[PDB]
């Protein structure tokens, strides 16, 4: 009888599915976690076009497992306590059409035995802290990596060191240390455990998909360090830029988080409303919240200029500078400038034409834009002290201009006629050269 | 953005000042502690005649600090977590007229760096147990002493060993062990932490002031052992007697607490309604509650008789006994007696006149007052077996009286005529001498 | 042994004694958390400070500030050169303030002395806040009045053959009416091409007080830069500063270098 099986539970941790007579006894009601988990189930089931195979690690009394089988999922629940699995099976038998199996076993051994494709979604709620406590953080990171490797999505509720109990002392400094080796992760909620006032965060993690409520797609590779608060995911015709505003440990000062926030926000604003006369990459999706923000854009051909420079690849500096200057002059005509023209913000296509790819540093108002013209000289010099004729003649001409006349329209016009300009080395000069060489050091 | 800073808090311990959208998330609402702390702020600000400088140690999200700056305080809040201070500063910036500064730092180092007069009030709520746990009880006592030394008042909420967590084991037996080296302390409330059913006591502590809601004054010295449940504070024209009914450890049996309670209560009753014919010290303030009671009296000139006896000072036993007997006879005429006439209850002024200074042992009804007359002989003998003529003749005369006639009016009358009384050594006597000598041993 | 006492506010070595246990003597220190205790000056103080804006301590009493410099410090803390510079600055400050130049309001000197370990100077206390604090705590400042008043005092010093080698925000105090004055005279000098370097730093000062110069500050600097170098001095700097609204617009000229050299200087 169910009555007996429930009584023999060491703890009624969860609601007993279909049996509200124990709801008052359950440590956690599970309705809040279930609301969120069913939303994510539906998103992923919609994306894949079918009901999911779900793995429930430390499934306890089966509530999540049965609740998803109720919606058509095929589920396997694992728990190392016989008493818990006895209840899960007795509940499944009351619901014979649910495709639900339960097994006694250890999460560590199950994860080692998993095969990729067997399960689409795994859930691990409030269980990994027990594995941390007995086996340490590094083994848990590897288990969670494998779990992500073999599924399409993982949902974790993770206990945290701020919880007031003795086992909190063995927890990592931040729960994100258990998952940050995985490719994609997002905080999706925080839940009251009824053990204390400290809530547990729930994360959605994937090694195969971008999972954003509006955009759910496989990616084939990703990157953290460009050229660690920013991650880039590459799919067939998209790049998803994912910025963390909220990072663990020291990592971001207040100012840096706000700048992550500012840049991504500014980039979204510009790209959703670009200026006429400028070909901006197209925007497929975007959003922001307290922890992070994201932007999914069309994927552009080419390589990042700084990589080409680092990997000593052959470059046409004329075509790169010409094309970039042309786009900068067109921006300026529409009252836009870019505050940070550097090799890692420039992409060069197969025909050696260049374009900006980060619009975080775009600005709309201001003497000016004289400073930006100055840095652009450094850019030029780093792209190559190092300027042969007629690049040097170009710069010398700019330097002879009154400063109120410095702007990107002028820079471009002089650049186009640089072969006609007088020879800098024939003049006393000589300072423009030394100031940028010191700048280009500085 | 505030949203991001709040999300990055390891814990939302407190209400976020001005932002009730996180009140449901806060571990503690802080309104109960704040009600009490603002009352004490006002009392001390009233006494000093000005807005206060306040130090908030382990200030977390700044709630107490901002709430007091709102009332005109100048505040500095200290916390060792960067995330907490980032939120405090962002909140202060929403309230630019608040004089509020926040710094990342360790309480131990801040206390060492404090200067006397820099802050009037320091608050340390639920933070010292963390310092106990890492550095031990003795270092925390010294830190708290210095904090009291450099401020006018300190408010502490202290965690206690009855809390059910592993760190409770490192706590002192009683939270008062962290503060009882400070001069003045009083329990002002007890608060629910939401971690468990065990509340934390809040103490008001000072090394410079008596801080009683009705009486708020500097003192220039204090004393525990007269001539440890009783403390005396001396200010310019007052003495404040402070009795603990509730003491830590074994210290007071039930009967002793009740006797502390009884004596102070009895003293208040007598002094607020003294008998005509008796100059009683005047009463400036008084009150009692579950933990303790206090009485502020006019300060009397002179020295305590027992000190004079111990420090072998010159005394006039005639004038001391005469003056004391005169006051005892006047009490008796009004139906009052003192149950405990001893050197430590008697004060002697510069002209060698004596008076009682503790009225805890005053009584109003009863064969009697024969026992008291007997002890008074011991008193006499200890003030000096040891009686020369005519003191011995005085006592001998009293002993020849039928016992129903023994009382302080008789004692006084015979004392005044003692030079005329017959010589005891000429009589068989001899017993009155031996009984008191054995009594005076006993 | 100073590690046992350096957390206390005021301390001074007053002697060293033979113990008769060995040839190593024991130092005797006089320590206080409430008073400056110098044989000539014995007064309560109500607050003190080590790091300005750890070999220098400042004590504040009712109408005084006592500057206390350690020449002899524990541990690594001061190299030989640094102790000598502590010694030099305090000595130089005492000399200047006890004999100030006419045309310059110098803070008054109440007491002073030096010995092997340290030196001290007790001065009148000036109203106002240190400029660098105001800058750090983003307080409202009038850069015109600050620069005007400072330049006026620098020009008057120069007329008497005095210059200040280290005009920086932490050496300047600004009163309630936004007038500024120097408060550290350790870096005062009396002889020398010159004072051209000092005029150059003063541009950095200016720029840090705000790359960052709007008109007519930029026009001021541009005018100075067009001057032959033998003409650079604080009298000139002040005169051009007072007429800066009339000077030609720098942005209308090729310039442009004075701007870039100070911006690199102001980084450097
Ligand atoms: C705190 S409960 C959480 C239950 C459930 N996941 C939930 O959040 O509603 C932890 C569960 O994991 C199980 N468990 C703990 N460690 C395990 C392991 N190494 N392998 C399998 N099950 C485990 C326990 O038996 C218990 O049922
Ligand atoms: C439990 S909370 C109490 C917060 C706040 N005082 C209150 O009662 O509302 C303890 C706070 O003290 C801080 N803290 C703990 N030890 C500290 C130390 N040694 N120095 C500075 N801050 C400390 C923690 O960062 C935390 O914000
Ligand atoms: N729209 C895009 N199309 C292709 N690559 C991109 C796009 N946006 C960013 N990247 C790439 O992102 C990588 C590192 O991030 P980022 O700092 O954006 O360059 C580089 O290899 C860029 O080429
Ligand atoms: N009203 C008072 N005036 C002066 N001293 C007092 C007064 N009441 C108590 N004391 C002093 O309190 C000290 C110790 O406490 P007690 O047991 O009250 O004597 C003695 O030194 C007494 O002289
Ligand atoms: N004569 C003075 N009057 C007032 N403050 C002074 C005086 N001399 C130095 N200070 C203060 O000393 C502090 C730090 O030392 P200093 O490096 O001298 O500025 C600053 O807050 C100054 O304002
Ligand atoms: Cl491992
Ligand atoms: Cl967990
Ligand atoms: Cl505590």
Residue numbers in the entry:
A (entry chain A), B (entry chain A): 4 to 230, 239 to 377, 381 to 398, 416 to 473
C (entry chain A): 178 to 230, 239 to 377, 381 to 398, 416 to 473
What does the primary publication say about this deposited structure?
The chain length of the O9a O-PS is tightly regulated by the WbdD enzyme. WbdD first phosphorylates the terminal non-reducing mannose of the O-PS and then methylates the phosphate, stopping polymerization. The 82 kDa WbdD protein from E. coli O9a comprises 708 residues and contains three domains, an N-terminal methyltransferase (MTase) domain, a kinase domain and a C-terminal domain (residues 460–708) that includes predicted coiled-coil motifs. WbdD is an unusual enzyme since it combines both a phosphate-methyltransferase and a sugar kinase activity.
Here, we report the 2.2 Å crystal structure of the bi-functional catalytic domain of the WbdD protein from E. coli O9a. The full-length WbdD protein was not tractable for biophysical characterization but a 63 kDa fragment, comprising residues 1–556 (WbdD556), could be expressed, purified and crystallized. The WbdD556 structure has an elongated shape with an N-terminal MTase domain (residues 1–210) directly adjacent to the kinase domain (residues 211–459). WbdD556 is a trimer in the crystal, consistent with its status in solution as judged by gel-filtration. The C-terminal α-helix (αV) (residues 459–473) of each monomer wraps around the crystallographic threefold axis forming a trimeric bundle reminiscent of a coiled-coil. Residues 474–556 are disordered, possibly because of packing constraints but are predicted to be helical. The S-adenosylmethionine (SAM) binding site located on top of the β-sheet. Positively-charged residues (R203, H132 and H133) cluster around the electrophilic methyl group, consistent with a phosphate binding site (arising from the phosphorylated sugar substrate). The pocket is occupied by sulphate in the WbdD556 structure, these crystals were grown from ammonium sulphate solutions whereas the pocket is empty (with the loops disordered) in WbdD459 crystals which were grown from a non-sulphate-containing solution. Our data show the two domains are arranged to produce the unique methyl-phosphate modification on the 3-OH of the non-reducing terminal mannose.
